[PDB]
Symmetry: C7
Subunit: 52 residues, 7 copies
């Protein structure tokens, strides 16, 4: 898939390898960063998301 | 479909191609912008929107 | 149709034609303004609502 | 009638004729004021409520 | 029965006759005070509760 | 019952006998302290909890 | 069998032995720390989480 770009509410821009989605087991937004590591972020700190 | 205009708490005015709707797998408001890029925005960052303008 | 007046948390009063209601597709309060335009407003920005003119 | 008084965030004391209740269509607390007009107030703006 | 004491976020303690419970019609915490009068308070204004 | 140690957001430590859990009737975290008193605390004021 | 790292609001970097998950009884994020102790932390207090 194409990369996705997340904009945090703390001024950061994060690249994800695929579409970030809520992990029903944690309630947080799960994604894979550019280094291929699985990450999760509090949804309250995610302002926007763009495909590409 | 008629475009919608969203106003964010950040002061931005954003144009969507169709009615923005919550995406069940993200919990955020999903839409496609005027440029055709698929975007999502936290509902807490949306102040209001209108159908057309 | 009965009109409503929405009072926002930012000092605005908006006239609605028909009772504003939560739109499950967006999670925001949906209504039609005095000009026939469909609008949506974040529930957190709605302080009170009065039925009438 | 059953008379209630709502105490709001901004310090107001509002008289309601009949028990105020959430309107599931709006998610807000619905009530009839001392003048017979139907009112609705955001739940987050209501601090306390009392019969009297 | 037994009394309960509620501690609000505004530095106040209210005595309740019986266990306060959410009134599903209002979404607030419902209880009967010492005066035997029906009272309701926004859950966001309740810090703690104790059974006396 | 096994003890649990709760830490509030305002920096206090509270010992519970038995696992604290949400009381569906109040929406708050319910527990019995080490001294046998039934208490409840607003979830928003609970930072963390540890078994032991 | 991979470990996880939780980043909290107060700048803590907590190692979890296993993927943290919400506990339906408390509504908080449940996990086991490096010392084998069962811990729980308010979702609102977790900024991010990383696998590795």
């Amino acid at each position: 898939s194409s990369n996705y770009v997340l904009h945090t509410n703390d001024g950061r821009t994060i690249v994800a390898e695929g579409k970030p989605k809520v992990d029903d087991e944690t309630g947080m937004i799960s994604y894979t960063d550019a280094y291929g590591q699985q990450q999760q972020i509090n949804r309250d700190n995610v302002k926007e998301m763009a495909k590409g």
